[PDB]
Structures are given as structure tokens and as C-alpha cells.
Design a protein around this nucleic acid. Structure first.
Lengths: 144, 60, 129, 185, 134
RNA sequence: AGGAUAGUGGCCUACCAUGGUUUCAACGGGUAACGGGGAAUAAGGGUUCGAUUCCGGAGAGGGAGCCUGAGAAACGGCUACCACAUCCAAGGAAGGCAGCAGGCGCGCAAAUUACCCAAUCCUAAUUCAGGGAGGUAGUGACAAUAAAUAACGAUACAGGGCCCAUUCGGGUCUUGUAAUUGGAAUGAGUACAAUGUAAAUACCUUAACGAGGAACAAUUGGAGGGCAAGUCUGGUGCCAGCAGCCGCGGUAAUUCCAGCUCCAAUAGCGUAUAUUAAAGUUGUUGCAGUUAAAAAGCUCGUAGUUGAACUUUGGGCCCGGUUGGCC
């Protein structure tokens, strides 16, 4: 016995010490206050319907080179700007300005990957054609 | 570097790679008969070791 | 909001409610796989002045409203079910493409309502562009 | 506003994906009698799992317990009504000792094989799903039948369906129409 | 062709409806998929009531092709059968009459076109005659 | 002590008494909180959902109030106000889809304005009348279970044997490969035709059909380690890009783009977000606390939690029950 009184009547005091020390993890503290329901631009959501303003680019750190051609997209359901990323090669000519886009996360749960800072979010679908079906091209590109 | 994603750098460097086409193999079997090849190739039609086994020995 | 009737006229066949017909586009030959649509029709309703009257079947030469198909055509349309035929004409109609006006939303947030607003206003009436 | 009908899944994938000999151990088990996928050795191992899970709970419970004297004796007879093992290992502790390839051995694929008539397990699985052989008179289109040990008196072809008789075919007749166009009218 | 062999099982005669209830087993080699009513006309001879007091539904074709499960119901009365036969089975047999009222969407709106009438309505019909055109 | 109440009761009323709950957490706030029977992962010990099939509750745009009736503070009943909203002759009158379809809005997001009481039941004077309760259907890769993508031949070639053992060439059983040329097996579709179904669709059935690589077709990821599968070829050269991490690309790229080959699962595969185990990285079983982050600077003390020993042990008689015993 090291601390934690084992006594059979004592079940309250080592339940409160259990629940107090429950507030130290990196996932329980964020499920307790609803981190995706007050903070966190995705409203508890794997996806959000987006609309792009225009194109930009963000550079990679040390050690590498080759600025990665990001995108600045605001969101419909909350109305605020955010930066994103197109994980692909080419096809940024295919995604236009001021048209519908549909984006998601990385699985990295925020906390941008290792390469480019301050970018959490990646592009799944633009105007309804899902550009992974455009890079490995077998699809309509519609009349704009 | 506010305008530094200048699109003269783009998928251009991919597009300056040449365009070719796949050659046409016969019909690979689809189903159990594909694995009928795959077991008998790995564990019956083998006579090679090179240590223990080497399944796709690219040209050494 | 606008789920707008397709003002149609059948030139062949008794058209039927609950029916599956091919849909085509403005300048299209059915050789390629792009922009031909294969869907079904919701309702076949008629209209007098300001009222409507649902029907079932009609022979040729009868204008009918056409419900729900409006999503899949732009300002004009043919919808065939013998896929060797051609498009029906657009005739290079008449007056007035013509003029331009800059239009902009205020208060920097209702851009989605504007872009859906005019991409639905384009399908609203074919005179404007 | 209605009553449901249930459903259940009857396999479970193994946990650690990639061990070289372990995947090739189930390539020996793939290569033995002509399977088509890797799922149908997952599911008898799943049936090995929750029967051995069922086998563990009576062995840890009491001796001269009638729940063990009922579902230990009724278990081992249903274990041998399919005839996985014989009378020699009927003492309720060999259900732990049962091994994969023995649940495989009483399948209708490798029972047509071992009882002549097919030359090959790859030819045997064809001779199940071509609307061929019955068990009794009941036709079986299932290559995973689990033979109930009481039709080796009677496992044969069908009365119809040649390679089985009573009409030599229909696609033989277009092959005989090739006779009925060259040397026939 | 190969002895269709009408065989009968669970032959239970009901005394309080003047009938029999029974399950027909049918093993029909070399020729399948016969009929509703040929098997009745072979069953209605071995039970000696009449030809058409029998009520079948069934011939559930078992797998393979050559075996089926039927279910017939012979009654011990001719005209009293129609008093208690299901009428869909009678119009399958053609002895009775098929009804034809309107469909669903014409009948229930007619109920809605029934409450607007005041009484028998011809008091309105005299009044909508005089006025219009007044 | 009465007033009402279907009857109990500070339920309400007048008088009188100052009382109720609490450091076992009341009170107050929050709650992406309907409550349970359960569901998911799973050594045991559990963590997290459960709006939703079953039981009970609340509500019918938001709060009130009321008649009829045995049963309602009903809402496919009414009255008034608010907030939405409709028609017109401008006088006024209609109003509740959190029922069933359907359409907006919001949308990461969710199906027909179908048939019919045939079934299970229900209501009424009562077989019948009725029931968008219900069942039948079209959308469906929301989930599960079974399992096609072609079989065996013959030649030839390399063989692997065995024995001729002198092995050029053999008999003998077996693998690939060169599509030479056969003979069968049909079934996914297709439909004479019957059944199924009240009615048809569809499954089970069943004539005439329905197969030689190109068809009647298998995709999705990947090939540095992680982690199984390339030191194969051509390209750009820290550009373009890859990648969940470590890290590659600056001229030979076993990672980028292609092409060949191969790996993994197979009618499915990834992808993203919340999850559970692995997390003996929340731990009661079961963590760590001299230096990895941490033992209040030290002590007193009320709750709380723990707290020495001692008080019929033993001996004997007999009876019946069970398990295993020259048996």
C-alpha cells in the first residue's frame, strides 16, 4: 500500500482521487468541455462545406525546401477564414477560385504534420468531383 | 513571400515527364485460380533459395 | 424558394408518371459518357392560370409541367430514351445577350448565398446570362 | 412498430497483420484443398475460438455439475455428429486439442475429393457449384456444407445433371448440334 | 412423367367447419412446376366430396427441381364452402365473382367529398340551380 | 380548525410554533442529459454510447384557460394573447405535417406525393363498414450470412524422382511452360412456360438460349524502415513532389512521375472524425514520487478512514446420506 487507503469502507475517497486525477489526459480534458463545440473550427465534424477565396502558398521548414502551395478557404456553417492544403501534385489549376469545396482533416488531430506549420486541413472534393478522381483522372470535369 | 506560390511552379514538372502506355498481358485468373497460381509459384514451382527464398528477384 | 417546373412539350409518345428516361444537355451527341444523365421523373403536373392539376399520361403535342427534373438541365433540354437520336435545336434564337452589371453582397459573409443565388438564377430564366 | 430479425457476423480477422511464415502457414492451409480467399479460414478459427471459449468455461467449472454433464456430453456428440474426430478421442478434453485442417477435412469440397470421382480439389469445388452432387436427395450448392457423417452410404451425383445421368446435357446438344450440322441435319 | 405422387400428411378433418386440413407433400421427378389446380383435380377424386370444394395454396418448389410442398383444403360442403371460403381463393378458382369498386385514391377522397354535403344535398342542388345564374 | 378535492396532504385559507438540508456535497451553475430493458470493444477488472424497434414519461409553433364525454386540461376539440403565416368583392373568414408520403431552410449528412386490408390486430349498433396502425412493393455497398469470374484433356519442352546407373535417350508418378487442337460442365444474365403473389415483381422451379482471352472481367492501396512485397528501366535534380512518424529529392532517387514485376485483402478496399483494447501511458485488481514531472517548510486538529489480545476448545457414543472399494 502506497497512499490509496485500501479499506473496504473507503470507496468514496479513492473515487474522488480517481476523478480529480482523471483531469490530466490530453483527450478527457477536451471531451469534458466540448472542445469541438466551442473552439476548434470543425463543429464536431470530420467535414465541413467550404468556399474558397483565392490561392496562396506556404513554405516548408528545416530541413527541406519547396513551398507547398496551400489554399485559403472560409467555411459556411460558421463563417470564418481558415488555411488548408492540397495533398497532391498538380491539380491546383483544376481547383478554381470562388467555387464549392469539401474538405476534411488528416487524422493528425490538429497539430500540423511535420512539414508545414499552421495548416490542419486537406481537400477532398471541389465542385462535386473529388480531385483524387482528377489526379488519377477518370472523371468529368464539369462545365463551370 | 506573400505571393510565393507562383504557379509557374506547378504540375508542369510532372507534365514534362513522357507519356507512355501499359502493355497488355493475358487474362489473369480472377478468384481461387489466381491463388492456385500464387501458391504453386511460391511453394511448388520454386527451386530457388538465395538464403531462404526470394520471391521477386529483380535483376542482380 | 424555387423547385421550378420544367415547361415541356412531348413530341412523341404518351409520357407517363413514374418513368425512367435519359437526359441530355445543350450541345451534346450521345457518343461520349460525359453530361448525359440517367434519372427518373417525380411528378407530371399540368397548369392553368396560377393553379396546377396532376395527370398521368399524355400523347404528343401537349405542354405539361414537369416536376423535379430541373436540377439536371441548363436553360434548355432534351430527354430521350432511344439512344441513337440527336439533340433538339437551340436555333441561335434572338436579341440581347447583352449588357453587364457589377453585383456585390455587402457585409462580407453571404457569399455562399450569392453564389448559389445566381447559379440558381441562371437556371431560373434563360434570357439572362 | 414491428419486430426485428437479428443478424450476426461469423468471422474475426486476426490482430497482427504481417508475419512472414504465419501468412504462409495459412498459405499451406490455402494451398491444401483449394480455397478462394483468406476469410474462410478466419471463420473456422472463429468457430475454433468460441467453441474453445465454450470449452474453457465448463472445464473450469465443477466436476459432477449437470450443466457440465449436459453441455459437455451434448457438445461432444454434436462435435462427432459432424464426425471431426472418432470414438477414440471421446473423453471431452480433446476438444481443446482440436486443430485447424480437421474442421477442413469434413467439408464437402474435400469429401468428394477423397471419395474418388474428382481427381482434384480444384475440380471438386467446381463439382459443387455447377448444380451438382446431392448429399441425400437434397441438392447442395454449398462448397462449405460440413457433412453430417450420415450420407457416406448415399453421397453420389444427382439423378439428373450428367456426370450423374438421366439426360446427357444441354450444352452437349449444341456440341451435338455441331454434329447435327456437319454430319447431321 | 415420373410419378408426380400426390401424397398427403397431417390429414386433420375439422368437424366444426365441415372440412379437412392437411399438408400435401409433392415429389415430382423429371417434370416440375405444374399448376395450382391439376393437383386438386387429382386430390378431389381420392377424397370423394366433389371436384371443387378443395382450396389449395402452395406448391413451394424445393431446391433441386422435383420436390414441392403443397397445402390444400377440401371442405365437406359445396355451397356452404363459399360462405366460408376466402374470396381471393374463389376468384382464383373463378366460381365466384371478382369485385371492382374504385381504387384507393378515388374512394378516400370520396369520403372527403361526403362530409361537405349538408344532408342529402339536393336542398343545395335546388339552391345552386336558382342562383347561378340567379 | 376549516374551503375545495375522485379521495390523502400547507393543496388553499385564518390563527399559532419557529422551523427544514449540510462538507456522506444540500443549495447554485452546467449538461451536444428523455429514463430503463441493452449495444460496441472484450483475460479478469472494465471504459464509452443508448435520439431509434420493447416498457414508462413529456409534447403536438410558445405559455395559459375550458366544454363534451366513463376516460382529456385532448390539440387530425374549442377560447384568448404572442410569433408566424393564407384567400379574396376591403366587408370578413379560414390556421397547425415532432402522423403518412412530399418540398423548402439548415445541411458532413438521411428514400416514393405507389398498391391494398391478403396477413397480425384494432374500433363501432357490429363477418362485411373502416384503419398512410399495418403489410406489399421501387432507392439502398447503413449493417450482416453463403459464394462466380472458367474445368479436365492431348502434344512438346525443361524437368523432379525411382530403377537402365555408361546417361547421349528411356518406362514409371508429378510441377510449370509453349493457347497447338479437343471433348465436356454450364450459370450471371435471357425467357417460351408454370408457380409464387388477393395482384404482379423477385427467390426456389423449367423449354430454346446463354464462353476460347478480346470476351460474359477485379477493384483499391502499396513495393526505404515501420511493415510483407525492387538495388529493374526512362524521366526532373531540394524545383516538382513523397510521406500518419523517422526522414528522402542538391545527376546513378531500392521513396517523386510513369512502365515491368511483385505484395495485401477480395466484392470489396482505403480516407476522415468520435471512439475501445493495445494505454501496468489513470491503474481497485494495477502506475510513479533520491536525481526522468512530483513527498505540502513544519506541526496541531474536527469530519473521513483505519485501530492489540481475551469469552465452547475438546473427548466419546449412535444414526442416516454421498463418492471410490476381494466385490
Amino acid at each position: 500500500g502506497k497512499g490509496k487507503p485500501r479499506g473496504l469502507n473507503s470507496a468514496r475517497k479513492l473515487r474522488v482521487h480517481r476523478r480529480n486525477n482523471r483531469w490530466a489526459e490530453n483527450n478527457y480534458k477536451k471531451r469534458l468541455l466540448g472542445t469541438a463545440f466551442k473552439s476548434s473550427p470543425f463543429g464536431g465534424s470530420s467535414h465541413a462545406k467550404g468556399i474558397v477565396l483565392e490561392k496562396l502558398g506556404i513554405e516548408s521548414k528545416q530541413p527541406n525546401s519547396a513551398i507547398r502551395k496551400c489554399v485559403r478557404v472560409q467555411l459556411i456553417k460558421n463563417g470564418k477564414k481558415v488555411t488548408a492544403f492540397v495533398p497532391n501534385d498538380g491539380c491546383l489549376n483544376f481547383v478554381d477560385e470562388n467555387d464549392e469545396v469539401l474538405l476534411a482533416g488528416f487524422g493528425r488531430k490538429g497539430k500540423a504534420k511535420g512539414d508545414i506549420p499552421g495548416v490542419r486541413f486537406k481537400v477532398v472534393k471541389v465542385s462535386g468531383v473529388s480531385l483524387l478522381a482528377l489526379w488519377k483522372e477518370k472523371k468529368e470535369k464539369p462545365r463551370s | 513571400a506573400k505571393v510565393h506560390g507562383s504557379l509557374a511552379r506547378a504540375g508542369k514538372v510532372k507534365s514534362q515527364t513522357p507519356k507512355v502506355e501499359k502493355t497488355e498481358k493475358p487474362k489473369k485468373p480472377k478468384g481461387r485460380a489466381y491463388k492456385r497460381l500464387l501458391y504453386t509459384r511460391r511453394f511448388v514451382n520454386v527451386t530457388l533459395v538465395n538464403g531462404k527464398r526470394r520471391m521477386n528477384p529483380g535483376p542482380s | 424558394k424555387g423547385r421550378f417546373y420544367a415547361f415541356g412539350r412531348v413530341f412523341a409518345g404518351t409520357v407517363k408518371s413514374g418513368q425512367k428516361v435519359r437526359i441530355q444537355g445543350p450541345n451534346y451527341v450521345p457518343g461520349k459518357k460525359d453530361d448525359l444523365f440517367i434519372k427518373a421523373i417525380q411528378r407530371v403536373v399540368l397548369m392553368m392560370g396560377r393553379f396546377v392539376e396532376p395527370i398521368d399520361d399524355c400523347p404528343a403535342g401537349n405542354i405539361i409541367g414537369l416536376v423535379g427534373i430541373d436540377q439536371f438541365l441548363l436553360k434548355t433540354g432534351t430527354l430521350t430514351t432511344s439512344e441513337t437520336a440527336h439533340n433538339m435545336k437551340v436555333m441561335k434564337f434572338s436579341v440581347s445577350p447583352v449588357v453587364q452589371v457589377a453585383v456585390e453582397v455587402k457585409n462580407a459573409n453571404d457569399l455562399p448565398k450569392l453564389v448559389e443565388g445566381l447559379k440558381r438564377l441562371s437556371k431560373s430564366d434563360p434570357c439572362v446570362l | 412498430p414491428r419486430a426485428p430479425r437479428t443478424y450476426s457476423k461469423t468471422y474475426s480477422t486476426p490482430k497482427r497483420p504481417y508475419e512472414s511464415s504465419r501468412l504462409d502457414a495459412e498459405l499451406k492451409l490455402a494451398g491444401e484443398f483449394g480455397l478462394k480467399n483468406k476469410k474462410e479460414i478466419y471463420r473456422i478459427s472463429f468457430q475454433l475460438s468460441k467453441i474453445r471459449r465454450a470449452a474453457r468455461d465448463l472445464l473450469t467449472r465443477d466436476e459432477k455439475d449437470p450443466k457440465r454433464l449436459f453441455e459437455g456430453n451434448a457438445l461432444i456428440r454434436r462435435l462427432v455428429r459432424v464426425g471431426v474426430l472418432s470414438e477414440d478421442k471421446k473423453k471431452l478434453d480433446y476438444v481443446l486439442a482440436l486443430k485447424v485442417e480437421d474442421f477442413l477435412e469434413r467439408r464437402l469440397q474435400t469429401q468428394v475429393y477423397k471419395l474418388g470421382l474428382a481427381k482434384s480439389v480444384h475440380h471438386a469445388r467446381v463439382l459443387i457449384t455447377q448444380r451438382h452432387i446431392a448429399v441425400g436427395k437434397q441438392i447442395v450448392n454449398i462448397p462449405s456444407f460440413m457433412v453430417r457423417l450420415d450420407s457416406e452410404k448415399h453421397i453420389d451425383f444427382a439423378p439428373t445433371s450428367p456426370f450423374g445421368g438421366a439426360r446427357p446435357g444441354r450444352v452437349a446438344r449444341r456440341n451435338a448440334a455441331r454434329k447435327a450440322e456437319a454430319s447431321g441435319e | 412423367s415420373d410419378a408426380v405422387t400426390i401424397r398427403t400428411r397431417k390429414v386433420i378433418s375439422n368437424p366444426l367447419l365441415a372440412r379437412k386440413q392437411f399438408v400435401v407433400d409433392v415429389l415430382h421427378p423429371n417434370r416440375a412446376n405444374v399448376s395450382k389446380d391439376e393437383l386438386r383435380e387429382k386430390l378431389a377424386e381420392v377424397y370423394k366430396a366433389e371436384k371443387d370444394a378443395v382450396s389449395v395454396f402452395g406448391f413451394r418448389t424445393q431446391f433441386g427441381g422435383g420436390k414441392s410442398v403443397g397445402f390444400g383444403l377440401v371442405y365437406n360442403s359445396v355451397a356452404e364452402a363459399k360462405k366460408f371460403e376466402p374470396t381471393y381463393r374463389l376468384v382464383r378458382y373463378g366460381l365466384a365473382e371478382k369485385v371492382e369498386k374504385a381504387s384507393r385514391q378515388q374512394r378516400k377522397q370520396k369520403k372527403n367529398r361526403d362530409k361537405k354535403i349538408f344532408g342529402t344535398g339536393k336542398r343545395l342542388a335546388k339552391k345552386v340551380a336558382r342562383r347561378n345564374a340567379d
